[PDB]
């Protein structure tokens, strides 16, 4: 099935756990687009509800040159775009470094994947709990050797897309 | 079974394959140190022969902060090797990484098999290592391959993927 990647800037936690909107990091545009294209992701969505942020990201993308990277305002808008491209609603999969008992592995994702997949990646201190609760699935977190697993969102994307590629 | 990572800035290729000395990108410092720490890498070496770069990078590490001995800014691969040899009482296996397939390339699984001592993983900047480093290394890893018409990742993302692959391979 087709795979889409969305980088979301709302609704994130701040250090104090309060809901925030984050600003766009330039390298998240360039780096994740490259990982997306390397592993055959169909489109890369950059989701920010702040018009000023969307205009900053467009300018960066416009000069760095593609219908490939899509700058949009909301997850609802991402879902609508995929339904027009696929004639089917994506499975909504969120990501987190945090433990979730219901979380599935990449292998399990392969077996349960009966339609397009939308992978959600956060910014700042990561998603509020509501995203994790509402998503169709959460992936098991990337862990390494010990307790520390706080990777950049760019590195988390690269790793997950690699694992998805290995598994097929 | 200790793993070390070195980010190198000389000698690198330009777009036309000529030798260049790249400058230290602040995000390579932070982003690769998180990946190394996640996956239990013993030390992260930042290698730049230009004293001005080492100075800038040292300041960035100090401010971004115990674990001040974790990310090591140094001048040459020779210095990296002498440090590991001191820490490990033995010389590491030198493995280079690149997006260009070499006929002699090994897989992670092969790497696991031949790894009887500490491992030093080399990553480049700019447009990658010149052919001399790939010739000089003990081994060169098969590139990360995806869809087939594109594989230009950032070096931060190549480090993440290779460290995950290696971790997983010692769990499977
Ligand atoms: C700077 S991190 C914030 C980390 C936060 N604790 C979280 O929920 O993952 C930004 C994004 O990168 C991804 N990420 C970072 N580390 C991850 C890990 N170890 N496992 C899965 N995703 C990770 C998640 O998508 C996260 O929203
Ligand atoms: C921006 S890349 C330069 C790419 C260059 N064509 C090369 O790989 O030689 C900088 C570093 O990222 C790493 N890298 C990037 N893409 C890679 C890939 N597909 N496979 C392996 N390493 C990669 C290598 O360590 C490379 O030196």
Automatic annotation (TrEMBL), chain B:
Q: Which domain of life is it from?
A: Bacteria
Record keywords: Cytoplasm, Metal-binding, Methyltransferase, S-adenosyl-L-methionine, Transferase, tRNA processing
Compartments, as annotated in UniProt: Cytoplasm
Respond yes or no to whether keyword Acetylation is given for this record: no
The residues covered by the tRNA (guanine-N(1)-)-methyltransferase C-terminal domain are: 2-166
Binding-site list for S-adenosyl-L-methionine 4? 97, 124, 144, 151-153
Give GO cellular component annotations, separated by semicolons.
cytosol
Q: Could you give a single Gene Ontology term from the biological process aspect?
A: tRNA N1-guanine methylation
**Molecular function terms in GO for this entry?**
metal ion binding; tRNA (guanine(37)-N1)-methyltransferase activity
The residues that the entry says bind S-adenosyl-L-methionine 2 are 13, 98-99, 124, 144, 151, 153
Give the binding site residues for S-adenosyl-L-methionine 3: 98-99, 124, 144, 151
Assembly and partners are described as:
Homodimer.
Q: Which family does it belong to?
A: Belongs to the RNA methyltransferase TrmD family.
Question: What function does this protein fulfil?
Answer: Specifically methylates guanosine-37 in various tRNAs.
Please identify the protein, giving its name as recorded.
tRNA (guanine-N(1)-)-methyltransferase
Q: What is the lineage of its organism?
A: Bacteria, Pseudomonadati, Deferribacterota, Deferribacteres, Deferribacterales
Q: Which residues of the full protein are shown?
A: 247 to 430 of 433
